[PDB]
Amino acid sequence: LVPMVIEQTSRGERSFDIYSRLLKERVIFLTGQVEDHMANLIVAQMLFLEAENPEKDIYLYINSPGGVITAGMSIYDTMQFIKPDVSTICMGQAASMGAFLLTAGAKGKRFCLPNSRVMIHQPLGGYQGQATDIEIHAREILKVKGRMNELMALHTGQSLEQIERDTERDRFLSAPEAVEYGLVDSILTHRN
Amino acid sequence: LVPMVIEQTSRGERSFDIYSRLLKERVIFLTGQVEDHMANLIVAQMLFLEAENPEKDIYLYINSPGGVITAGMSIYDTMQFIKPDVSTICMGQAASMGAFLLTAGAKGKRFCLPNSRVMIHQPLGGYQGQATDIEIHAREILKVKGRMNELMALHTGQSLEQIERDTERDRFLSAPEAVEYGLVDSILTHRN
Amino acid sequence: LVPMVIEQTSRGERSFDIYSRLLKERVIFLTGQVEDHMANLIVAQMLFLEAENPEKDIYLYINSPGGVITAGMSIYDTMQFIKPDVSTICMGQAASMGAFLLTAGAKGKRFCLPNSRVMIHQPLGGYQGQATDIEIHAREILKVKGRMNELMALHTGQSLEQIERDTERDRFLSAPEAVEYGLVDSILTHRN
Amino acid sequence: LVPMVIEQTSRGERSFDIYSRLLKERVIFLTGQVEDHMANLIVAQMLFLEAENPEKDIYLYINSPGGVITAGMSIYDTMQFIKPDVSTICMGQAASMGAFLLTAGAKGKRFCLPNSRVMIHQPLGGYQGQATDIEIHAREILKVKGRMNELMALHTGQSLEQIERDTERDRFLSAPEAVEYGLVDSILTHRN
Amino acid sequence: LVPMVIEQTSRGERSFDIYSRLLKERVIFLTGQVEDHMANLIVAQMLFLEAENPEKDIYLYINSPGGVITAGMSIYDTMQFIKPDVSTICMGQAASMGAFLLTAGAKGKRFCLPNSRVMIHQPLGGYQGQATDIEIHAREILKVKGRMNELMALHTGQSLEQIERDTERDRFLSAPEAVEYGLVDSILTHRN
Amino acid sequence: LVPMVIEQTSRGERSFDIYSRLLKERVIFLTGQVEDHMANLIVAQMLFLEAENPEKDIYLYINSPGGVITAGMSIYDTMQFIKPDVSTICMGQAASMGAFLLTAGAKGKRFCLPNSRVMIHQPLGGYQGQATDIEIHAREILKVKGRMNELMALHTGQSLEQIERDTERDRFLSAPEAVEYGLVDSILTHRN
Amino acid sequence: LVPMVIEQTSRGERSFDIYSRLLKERVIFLTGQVEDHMANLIVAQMLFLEAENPEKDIYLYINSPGGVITAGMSIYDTMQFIKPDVSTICMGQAASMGAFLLTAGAKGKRFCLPNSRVMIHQPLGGYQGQATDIEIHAREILKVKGRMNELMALHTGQSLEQIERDTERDRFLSAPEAVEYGLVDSILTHRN
Amino acid sequence: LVPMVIEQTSRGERSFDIYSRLLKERVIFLTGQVEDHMANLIVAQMLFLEAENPEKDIYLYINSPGGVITAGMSIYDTMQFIKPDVSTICMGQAASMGAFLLTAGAKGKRFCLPNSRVMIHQPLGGYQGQATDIEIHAREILKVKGRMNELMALHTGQSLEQIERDTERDRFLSAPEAVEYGLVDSILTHRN
Amino acid sequence: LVPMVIEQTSRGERSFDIYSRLLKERVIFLTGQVEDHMANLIVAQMLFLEAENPEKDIYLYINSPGGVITAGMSIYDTMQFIKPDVSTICMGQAASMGAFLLTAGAKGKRFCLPNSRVMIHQPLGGYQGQATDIEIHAREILKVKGRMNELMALHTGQSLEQIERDTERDRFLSAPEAVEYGLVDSILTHRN
Amino acid sequence: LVPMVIEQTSRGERSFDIYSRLLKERVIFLTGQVEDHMANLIVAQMLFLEAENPEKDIYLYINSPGGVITAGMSIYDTMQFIKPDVSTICMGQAASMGAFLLTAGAKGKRFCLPNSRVMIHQPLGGYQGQATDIEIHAREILKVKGRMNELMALHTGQSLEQIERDTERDRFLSAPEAVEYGLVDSILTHRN
């Protein structure tokens, strides 16, 4: 169930959803596995917010255990295309795709809660069929792995070699570790 | 089915849901297993209530058998971030995650019903794969266990060593026991 | 869940859906597998947009892993029938059907995000029954394969022989590769 | 999800569905398998359109892999009963029932997209029980096959003998082949 | 999905459903298997129409493969109880229960489409248990069979003996055959 | 598994299974549900024992919870056909069919253990189909019930009305009660 | 399991199973559903007995609920082909296929137990597919039904028309009734 | 369960299975679905019989509904490879594969029982995958159909066109019809 | 269920199985999917036959749709290691793994029946996991494909490039075609 | 099934299964997944062979995709405990456990076929439960990984660090590669 909220404006009362109300404040939620439908939905919200005000920052809360890579790329590409700075905030946890989108936020506007966790790992996949087909798919995933590592190094500031070594196996980083690793910028403990 | 209520205001009648109506009074319900979607929904409500009035206390009724830890951390972090004091009330029962959020409320504003039960235990998890991967996940869950114990001791006021011994196995505490254990502040028997 | 947006017009406020709001701006989403219902839905949107303004271009974001061929042909035929130029944008990935529709857009108005992937392969199918029926179905799919290759060569500009060789097995092309291959026109990195 | 459209009329704005909006323009969609519920729904639309204006032609887009025969007969009978000429348009594909309804449209108003496919085959069925019951059902389906062939010849203009030979096994016809076979009238390549 | 229609009345516009709109014109649809819920729904519509105008005829389109007998009796009894003449129209097909209700319409107002089929057969049933219980249920179904035959003869005008012989096994009758058999009155080929 | 025993017969030493060893002594076991396969096995054993000595008594242990009547009737006919008398001993349970075979033993040779349960009930059956088929099976099951009641009265000695009245529902009779009812002749407590 | 028995002969003592022991005396058991595997087993036994002694009659105990017609026909042809007369005895029950084989024994050597039940019905089948192929199967089942009735009439002695009327629906015949109908020659009640 | 038989010989006593005993007489049983495992068993028996005596005919009883084509051809080639004449006898039924093997026997040694069904139809197959793979399998199944038709014509003596026309769809042939068609040489109704 | 055979020798009567009897003649059957268990059984048989007579040739009939590559390679290595020349006969079919073993026989001893199909395709595999693991498995299968092609080229005599192109996709061959390709060197039409 | 072989001896002929016959020659087969049950058979066979001749070598054929570590360790300990040198031959493949046993053979007596693959990887496990139990099981598997690496290093002769780095992920080795690594000592291509 989604609670209903009311907005008191000069024009009059307006019924809004908890998620819809926050959207009006330039807040987007990225929850659950990253799939095509949910990812496509986030893309629409970003475009709508840009048209309303291409100068105000967009906040994207990330709490997901990761998901499809192609779906995440659409979100990543959209964030880098729209002029507004997409401020990413990590709540609960951030998996490979969640962490990738978390670090993809505007420099200096990537935050993570003190108890939030972050996990980074190489792409997962597989294929069944003839040897020729396996080689084609094997090369494709390898290219995705290389492309993902390059982007992570660009945003995190770490060397490509270091990212590859750390991404060979699941790596868990807490909020303080993410800051030192360049994955995020600061931590939000209390409201000032 | 969710019953519909009516609010008689000077402006006019307004159709509201039983849960939505209480939300307008700064009341949030945390029912069922703690997952990402439900936890994310609660986070939105807390942020919305803070914007409406960052000085009025927020009430969070807890009745759940526990759930994911990462999801609970987001709620815990949000509670410690928003200026309003989140008053946690335990109804029915409070599991490990429910108890953790219950004790995370503002000091002196944590209540529990006389017949409510509270259960605290160490984190649960598991992994299947290579030995190297098992070690990585084993260390991650251990860190979460240590982090959870530190937070419990901070809010409950007990020593870290005492929390570890009590959390080694499921521990059931009634309302009077929770008060003496520092998990809660008082009990709500009748309205004064 | 689909967030609700508000449009501030001189006539007054209007409640709109995230997808419906974008539709008002001549934007169509093609997400998920290409089936009859989803494809039929897209056809209706194209016809509605043409009636509203047969001179303004139509934007069709493509993010799908492909699907039925007959369903895609309806979309392809509708795009080539309506006077407005259908600008196809690739987000995330474009499978055989997604790539076919992506390249079917108006010349010079086919875009792809920098991290988007494109996959092209020959038609997939099969039939169980008598040998006589198998031959009929085998010939039918072969004709579809030939027809698809001819259309791909027409839009991509490549020779029919080259398309057949490249479509024999799954072929993955990135944004820069698609531009050189003639599948797309340019790339959208940042908003100018 | 069904997008919502807005109709700007002198009376005022009106919220409409993508399918409902087209229905107001005398456009009916026949998608998915031909069952009793969907077929019954189409019958209601035809009757409603006839009452609104029994002189304006009705457009029926056909994109279905076929279905029940009894359900299709209701649609076919309704089309031949209402005074308005039902213009049938084939999008994607037209199976035995889809093709039967496609050719049942008003003479000279049956269209098919250039890439649309058409398949025609004899009725499919079966029964399990006593030999006496099998004979009754076997005769019934045979009568339906004969009746279907007669109607196909009437609309297509081909000889009854030719239809029987072509319908013995699945026959696939493209848009140009359908025109020469008399199944359709013309092709819609581009809007003039 | 159920399309939405608009009714242009002097009072103003009114949003209506395709089925609801036809109901306002004294038209009832009987689709799918005859169960208790659907049958009960039809009973309510008949009562509502009678109150609105107990002098105008009621149209009941029948397209169903048959179903429960007790459910059909409620519809049959309601039709014979309300003063308005219930005009039954067969679309697609009419099974044992559908045929029974089709012939139960007012004399001279029972129509069937040219391509509609009609099937009549004896009641179907079964029971598992003690021999004493089997005899009770066996007698009950036999009584229902006799009662059904008597009603069919009364409406069809045929002799009770003839109905029993024809109902022993499934009997398929086309529109012309139904007219000669007394099951219907005339056929609706084209609107005059 | 079944243990193997050795018999020190004259001229040699042979090893036979426990069941085969008892069969050589004119002992037959009737365990489990009564079916055609097990019933034929018992019939074969009874016929074989008749050849070795058509005068020595045959023993048949009954510990079955009942089963198919047709399968059981085959044993009853064999018991009353072969010249050797069949002594039935009830061990454990004896349902309708099991009890029927228990009473089929020769007069004065029907025994029962002290702690044994005998349950007699009317035939259990069921059929689903046309009303005509229901009557055919309904009549047959009733005839079988009457036939079994007549046989029960003949062996037990109770009046036909008493058997029918007592067989309407399950009737549990202990060992001493079975003797009074006439199902068995005596009870075997200890060797004397 | 299957008990083992010892047979005394000039050579010495030989161990035989219950079924194999009775096979020496030219006794074949036909139990359970009639299928190709069990049918071939009976055919092999009949041929083996013919070679051992082509002048001694063969006894076939029939206790089955029916089965495949083709499998049963293999046994019927073998019984009529082999010179030795085949004596059929009905134990428990004899369904359509079982009854057909029961009446297929040598005239005068067909017996039935007093409580045995014989049921005869027309062939049952079914086919799912096109209208052309279903007609082939629907026409073949009728030929089998006609051929089956002709053989039944020849062995029973009743007119072909009478067999068709009685075989239209399931008909149960008791041991005495089977004698009058001609399915059996006499009834075996006791050994004399 | 297969009964055991004893073969009395001057040398001594010996035990054999029902099928093993007939194997010594150069008799092979082909029952059930045709597959590689059962086919190999038949091939092994043929090779064993050839080694024992290559100048004696081998009798093969065919009763099966057909099966895999490769498994069936493995038996057909073995029959022609071994010099001993392989006599084929049809019992019960002989489907496509069974009929092919039935007619593959040595000329003048193909027999069929009076009541036996013979069905011949084109090969059945199916494949799912890329269009290129469909053509490979589609062409192979067509070649198998042509190869089998050629062999059928050679054994039956019919023309190639006649076999193709009759084999296009299932064709049931009775024992007398099989003689005229050439599938068999004579019918064995009684032993002389 | 396998038949038993008797071998006559000076020692006395000896019982054998159909497959065991043919083993004495140096005949091995390869049927069903190739797996480790069945492969080890063939390896043991080959080693056993070598000890009895390391000079006589072994006949390995191949009829299988292929299987595991590792299991097949164990048989290939054993055949090449043992001094005796293994003669391979293809009956029914020979897939990739089956065809590889068929062509692995000694020169001039690789036979094929007149009606048999040979399929040669590249190895099939698949893996799910991290990108690093996929590359390892993807590269491993490629080595197997290359190694397999080299072995087939050596035995068939074709060039390595020719084998790679022909094995890139499924390729079916007949008995005569296999001779020209080099898989076999003769066809066993009739025993000479 | 497993074939039977006859061994010629001075006393007379004896019948043994294929596997038992090779057991007398000090040959043990290790096929399929390694488990406790199959492991005991190998352990029992190895112990039995030691008593027969504690001086002759024992041959163990390894062809399996690994298995349980505890079950495999029982074989390794038994292999090292028994005085006779155990020669291990790799046929088909040898996974982690299979490879460990392959390299555990006596020095200079470890062989592998020319076409075989050897795979080595770290132990795979997994446990779900309380965090405290995860650490216990996580540490246990780590000890096994370290213990197995030490044993493999000792047999292969390589440094412990090299084994850890190479065994960190799945590693496939061919016959010549295994010799260089140290898993095997020679390759058996042909019998000299």
Short mmCIF file of all heavy atoms in Angstrom, two decimals, chain A residues 44-70:
data_model
loop_
_atom_site.label_atom_id
_atom_site.label_comp_id
_atom_site.label_asym_id
_atom_site.label_seq_id
_atom_site.Cartn_x
_atom_site.Cartn_y
_atom_site.Cartn_z
N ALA A 44 12.39 8.09 -17.35
CA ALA A 44 11.32 9.05 -17.60
C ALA A 44 11.30 10.14 -16.53
O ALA A 44 11.12 11.32 -16.84
CB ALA A 44 9.97 8.33 -17.66
N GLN A 45 11.47 9.75 -15.26
CA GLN A 45 11.46 10.74 -14.19
C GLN A 45 12.59 11.75 -14.36
O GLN A 45 12.39 12.96 -14.18
CB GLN A 45 11.58 10.04 -12.84
CG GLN A 45 10.44 9.08 -12.54
CD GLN A 45 10.58 8.42 -11.18
OE1 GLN A 45 10.85 9.09 -10.18
NE2 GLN A 45 10.41 7.11 -11.14
N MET A 46 13.79 11.28 -14.72
CA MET A 46 14.91 12.19 -14.91
C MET A 46 14.62 13.19 -16.02
O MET A 46 14.89 14.39 -15.88
CB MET A 46 16.18 11.41 -15.21
CG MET A 46 16.72 10.63 -14.02
SD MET A 46 18.24 9.75 -14.39
CE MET A 46 18.64 9.08 -12.78
N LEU A 47 14.09 12.71 -17.15
CA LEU A 47 13.77 13.61 -18.25
C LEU A 47 12.71 14.62 -17.84
O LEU A 47 12.82 15.81 -18.17
CB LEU A 47 13.31 12.81 -19.46
CG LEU A 47 14.32 11.82 -20.04
CD1 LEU A 47 13.70 11.01 -21.16
CD2 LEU A 47 15.56 12.55 -20.53
N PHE A 48 11.68 14.17 -17.12
CA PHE A 48 10.64 15.09 -16.68
C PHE A 48 11.19 16.15 -15.75
O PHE A 48 10.85 17.33 -15.87
CB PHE A 48 9.51 14.30 -16.00
CG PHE A 48 8.48 15.18 -15.34
CD1 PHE A 48 7.48 15.76 -16.09
CD2 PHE A 48 8.52 15.41 -13.98
CE1 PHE A 48 6.53 16.56 -15.49
CE2 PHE A 48 7.58 16.21 -13.37
CZ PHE A 48 6.58 16.79 -14.13
N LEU A 49 12.05 15.75 -14.81
CA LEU A 49 12.62 16.72 -13.88
C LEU A 49 13.51 17.72 -14.61
O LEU A 49 13.51 18.92 -14.28
CB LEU A 49 13.41 16.00 -12.79
CG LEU A 49 12.59 15.15 -11.82
CD1 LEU A 49 13.51 14.46 -10.83
CD2 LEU A 49 11.56 16.00 -11.09
N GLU A 50 14.27 17.26 -15.60
CA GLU A 50 15.13 18.17 -16.35
C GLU A 50 14.31 19.25 -17.04
O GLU A 50 14.68 20.43 -17.01
CB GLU A 50 15.96 17.39 -17.37
CG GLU A 50 16.97 18.23 -18.14
CD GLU A 50 17.61 17.46 -19.28
OE1 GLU A 50 17.04 16.44 -19.71
OE2 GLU A 50 18.70 17.88 -19.74
N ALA A 51 13.20 18.87 -17.67
CA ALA A 51 12.37 19.85 -18.36
C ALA A 51 11.79 20.86 -17.38
O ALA A 51 11.74 22.06 -17.68
CB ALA A 51 11.25 19.14 -19.12
N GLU A 52 11.33 20.40 -16.22
CA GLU A 52 10.76 21.31 -15.23
C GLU A 52 11.78 22.35 -14.79
O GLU A 52 11.46 23.54 -14.69
CB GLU A 52 10.24 20.52 -14.03
CG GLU A 52 9.03 19.65 -14.34
CD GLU A 52 7.80 20.47 -14.69
OE1 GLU A 52 7.82 21.70 -14.47
OE2 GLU A 52 6.81 19.87 -15.18
N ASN A 53 13.01 21.92 -14.51
CA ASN A 53 14.05 22.84 -14.08
C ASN A 53 15.42 22.23 -14.37
O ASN A 53 15.94 21.46 -13.56
CB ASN A 53 13.90 23.14 -12.59
CG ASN A 53 14.80 24.28 -12.14
OD1 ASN A 53 15.94 24.40 -12.58
ND2 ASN A 53 14.28 25.12 -11.25
N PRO A 54 16.03 22.55 -15.51
CA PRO A 54 17.34 21.98 -15.84
C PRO A 54 18.50 22.53 -15.02
O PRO A 54 19.65 22.22 -15.33
CB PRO A 54 17.51 22.33 -17.32
CG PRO A 54 16.69 23.55 -17.51
CD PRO A 54 15.52 23.40 -16.60
N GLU A 55 18.23 23.34 -13.99
CA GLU A 55 19.28 23.91 -13.16
C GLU A 55 19.29 23.39 -11.74
O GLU A 55 20.30 23.55 -11.05
CB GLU A 55 19.15 25.44 -13.12
CG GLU A 55 19.23 26.11 -14.49
CD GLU A 55 20.59 25.94 -15.14
OE1 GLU A 55 21.53 25.49 -14.45
OE2 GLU A 55 20.71 26.25 -16.34
N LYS A 56 18.21 22.77 -11.27
CA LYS A 56 18.15 22.25 -9.91
C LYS A 56 18.66 20.81 -9.88
O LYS A 56 18.36 20.01 -10.77
CB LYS A 56 16.72 22.31 -9.37
CG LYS A 56 16.26 23.72 -9.03
CD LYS A 56 14.83 23.73 -8.51
CE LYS A 56 14.70 23.04 -7.16
NZ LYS A 56 15.61 23.62 -6.13
N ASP A 57 19.43 20.50 -8.84
CA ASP A 57 19.99 19.17 -8.69
C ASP A 57 18.90 18.13 -8.48
O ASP A 57 17.84 18.41 -7.91
CB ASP A 57 20.97 19.13 -7.51
CG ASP A 57 22.17 20.02 -7.73
OD1 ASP A 57 22.40 20.44 -8.88
OD2 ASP A 57 22.89 20.30 -6.75
N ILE A 58 19.17 16.91 -8.94
CA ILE A 58 18.25 15.78 -8.82
C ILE A 58 18.83 14.80 -7.81
O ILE A 58 20.02 14.45 -7.89
CB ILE A 58 18.02 15.10 -10.18
CG1 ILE A 58 17.29 16.05 -11.13
CG2 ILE A 58 17.23 13.81 -10.00
CD1 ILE A 58 17.22 15.55 -12.56
N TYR A 59 18.00 14.36 -6.88
CA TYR A 59 18.42 13.42 -5.84
C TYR A 59 17.93 12.03 -6.21
O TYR A 59 16.75 11.85 -6.55
CB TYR A 59 17.87 13.84 -4.48
CG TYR A 59 18.37 15.19 -4.02
CD1 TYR A 59 17.64 16.34 -4.30
CD2 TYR A 59 19.56 15.32 -3.33
CE1 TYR A 59 18.09 17.58 -3.88
CE2 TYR A 59 20.01 16.55 -2.91
CZ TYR A 59 19.27 17.68 -3.20
OH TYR A 59 19.72 18.91 -2.78
N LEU A 60 18.82 11.05 -6.13
CA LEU A 60 18.52 9.66 -6.46
C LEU A 60 18.94 8.78 -5.30
O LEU A 60 20.14 8.60 -5.06
CB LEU A 60 19.23 9.24 -7.75
CG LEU A 60 18.98 7.80 -8.21
CD1 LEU A 60 17.57 7.64 -8.73
CD2 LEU A 60 19.99 7.40 -9.27
N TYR A 61 17.96 8.23 -4.58
CA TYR A 61 18.25 7.34 -3.47
C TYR A 61 18.44 5.94 -4.03
O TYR A 61 17.58 5.43 -4.76
CB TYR A 61 17.12 7.37 -2.44
CG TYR A 61 16.86 8.73 -1.83
CD1 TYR A 61 15.74 8.96 -1.05
CD2 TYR A 61 17.74 9.79 -2.03
CE1 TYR A 61 15.50 10.20 -0.49
CE2 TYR A 61 17.50 11.03 -1.48
CZ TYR A 61 16.38 11.23 -0.71
OH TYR A 61 16.14 12.47 -0.15
N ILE A 62 19.56 5.31 -3.68
CA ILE A 62 19.90 3.98 -4.18
C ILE A 62 19.84 2.99 -3.02
O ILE A 62 20.53 3.16 -2.01
CB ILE A 62 21.29 3.97 -4.84
CG1 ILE A 62 21.30 4.87 -6.09
CG2 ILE A 62 21.71 2.56 -5.21
CD1 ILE A 62 22.68 5.23 -6.61
N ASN A 63 18.98 1.98 -3.16
CA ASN A 63 18.84 0.88 -2.20
C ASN A 63 18.40 -0.32 -3.03
O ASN A 63 17.20 -0.55 -3.21
CB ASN A 63 17.85 1.16 -1.08
CG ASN A 63 17.79 0.03 -0.06
OD1 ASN A 63 18.68 -0.82 -0.02
ND2 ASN A 63 16.74 0.01 0.75
N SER A 64 19.37 -1.09 -3.51
CA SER A 64 19.04 -2.21 -4.37
C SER A 64 20.14 -3.24 -4.30
O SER A 64 21.30 -2.89 -4.02
CB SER A 64 18.84 -1.73 -5.82
OG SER A 64 19.98 -1.04 -6.30
N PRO A 65 19.83 -4.52 -4.52
CA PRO A 65 20.89 -5.54 -4.50
C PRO A 65 21.51 -5.74 -5.87
O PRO A 65 22.20 -6.73 -6.10
CB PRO A 65 20.14 -6.79 -4.04
CG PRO A 65 18.78 -6.61 -4.57
CD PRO A 65 18.49 -5.13 -4.51
N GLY A 66 21.28 -4.80 -6.79
CA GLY A 66 21.81 -4.90 -8.13
C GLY A 66 20.84 -5.56 -9.09
O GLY A 66 19.76 -6.02 -8.72
N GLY A 67 21.24 -5.61 -10.36
CA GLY A 67 20.39 -6.21 -11.37
C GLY A 67 21.02 -6.28 -12.74
O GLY A 67 22.24 -6.44 -12.88
N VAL A 68 20.19 -6.16 -13.78
CA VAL A 68 20.69 -6.22 -15.15
C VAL A 68 21.64 -5.05 -15.40
O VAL A 68 21.47 -3.95 -14.87
CB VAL A 68 19.53 -6.21 -16.15
CG1 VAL A 68 20.05 -6.36 -17.57
CG2 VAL A 68 18.53 -7.32 -15.83
N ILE A 69 22.65 -5.30 -16.24
CA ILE A 69 23.63 -4.26 -16.55
C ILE A 69 23.09 -3.31 -17.61
O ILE A 69 23.17 -2.09 -17.46
CB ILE A 69 24.95 -4.91 -16.99
CG1 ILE A 69 25.59 -5.66 -15.82
CG2 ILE A 69 25.90 -3.84 -17.52
CD1 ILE A 69 26.65 -6.65 -16.24
N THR A 70 22.52 -3.85 -18.69
CA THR A 70 21.98 -2.99 -19.74
C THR A 70 20.99 -2.00 -19.17
O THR A 70 20.97 -0.83 -19.57
CB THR A 70 21.33 -3.84 -20.84
OG1 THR A 70 20.27 -4.62 -20.27
CG2 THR A 70 22.35 -4.76 -21.48
#
